[model samples]
Target: LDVCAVVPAAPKQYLSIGNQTILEHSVHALLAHPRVKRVVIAISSRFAQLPLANHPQITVVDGGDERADSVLAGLKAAGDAQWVLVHDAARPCLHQDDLARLLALSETSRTGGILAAPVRDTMKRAEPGKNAIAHTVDRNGLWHALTPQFFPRELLHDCLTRALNEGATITDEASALEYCGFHPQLVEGRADNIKVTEDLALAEFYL
Candidate 1:
């Protein structure tokens, strides 16, 4: 609805260990990217007090209990936009080239798509009591999900509404959309594109 405008979003529950710096870097990377139009950050109640520097285009909205809720709040506050990019605050290595490629892919596809990477190693069906040698999972179609899932603003809003109404609490937007009977394309990205979720991930941030 914002006339071909691009929106970048952040849904931060809290500052994970050393995520502040990474988030700042991500914002800068987004702002610096040639394809980004504006940045909207959604932080939960606890993170509302976090100081966000002045950036005319950077809008911060009070977050909700769940990630989807926070994103919905941001989308509503953003009003309407042609396209929206959902990014994670913990992922700091979003490259300009990747953003550009993803945008291009999203623009041409009917069902919106997301950035993802192929499963490098063969995965297993490991579980409690299931040995490491358990049946090998088919990695052929497996992809590691990444953020900046791009979609038509209207479609995304509809999916979110359905998810909330259906009592679905999927963390990833893609899963919510899937629950709503829509399949989003996962645009292929690099293996290095990762969400910093553990202590080891934080350490990898420096390298």
Candidate 2:
């Protein structure tokens, strides 16, 4: 039951209008999780001392300019662990059972896997000319990947190292693993774990 969690830091802009409250809530949720032993929060170096109190189970890391860089920084801070779960801070409702499930799946695979959900609704390709539909796409075998992507410690570090060297423009960890020609299994999960990115999403968060 070895696990270390990582979350990217909140921007200064988010500190206003109740974002700090949300961050605390998120931190509490991760802290309360039974399986999570430690957490490393990666934030910008400029905002490294944002009044976050140190705890026995959590450590804060000064982040990089880019998102991937921040993630890598968090990974480095975590150091050695059997599995590292890269989670999103905005996903406040990430459940304990869901976390347990993802870790279980990662243990089964040689490399690792991610939390994902199968698409349930119709999809379409839109054209620019008239905002017309180009064609409907199949949803079979497709899943929307979620965070807390569990990976073997060494494998993840190696993947990130290769990505940094190759100038990979990956927006997520799965992309780096894919670049190495290994398919990280997508474990199906609930869609409630949404990334709070906009006002509308936050409004929907309470409902």
Candidate 3:
């Protein structure tokens, strides 16, 4: 399996969580899985130093203007690998058990799946362009989608390329699959596996 990590511009993935950078931890998490043959890191060229740059299992590629573009670039570099795992460079708290659980889907699921946490809080639908709540939306059947979204290599490649070509919103890998009428299974994971944005402390705690 190939792990595709889509990194953002200079300052994001380079942010230090502890002694190591977020991207370092994120890449290492995938490395822990024995079946992961390569970690394809797609990032903008502005960032000078990359984590594990010289490692044999890691390959760095120039990313695009958007997340979908970066993913496609990684997919192209991935070649003929049968499976792909698209991850977020900012999420560094992925546990080994959770990674194993997500990978287990490949044995049974044809369309593949992702690691997600069930939504536990009250939901709301805000008025467009306003902070005011329009209504309380249903929380059931809702989930906070997380990274390490797994899929067949070719299926993901075709779906994402088609989505971007057609001008569809490419939020995450699963969204690309959804646009093509495929339902990716959701494997329940720890709620602490978060994407670090502004809260460095919370991420460090989870890590």
* TM-score for each predicted model, relative to the true structure: 0.81, 0.84, 0.91
lDDT tens per residue, model 3, 1-207:
544433332256678876788888888898888878788887664344654778888887887889888888887778667888888888888899998999888789899999999998999999999999999999999999998899888898888888889999878899999998899999999999888775688888777
For model 3, the stretches where C-alpha displacement exceeds 4 angstroms are 1-10, 45-47, 128-131
Which residue pairs show backbone clashes in model 3? none
Each model's lDDT: 0.68, 0.71, 0.82
Task: Please estimate how well model 2 matches the true structure, expressed as its whole-model Cα lDDT.
Answer: 0.71
lDDT of candidate 3?
0.82
How do all the candidates rank in terms of lDDT, highest first? 3, 2, 1
Number of the predicted model whose TM-score against the real structure is largest: 3
In angstroms, give how far residue 89 of model 3 lies from its true place.
0.5
Question: Which lDDT tens digits does candidate 2 get at residues 1-207?
Answer: 667887877342233234453455566566676767888887654333445445677788876876667778888887567778787766655666776778786547877888888887888888767788989888887678887788887888888889878998877788888888878888766677666566434534642
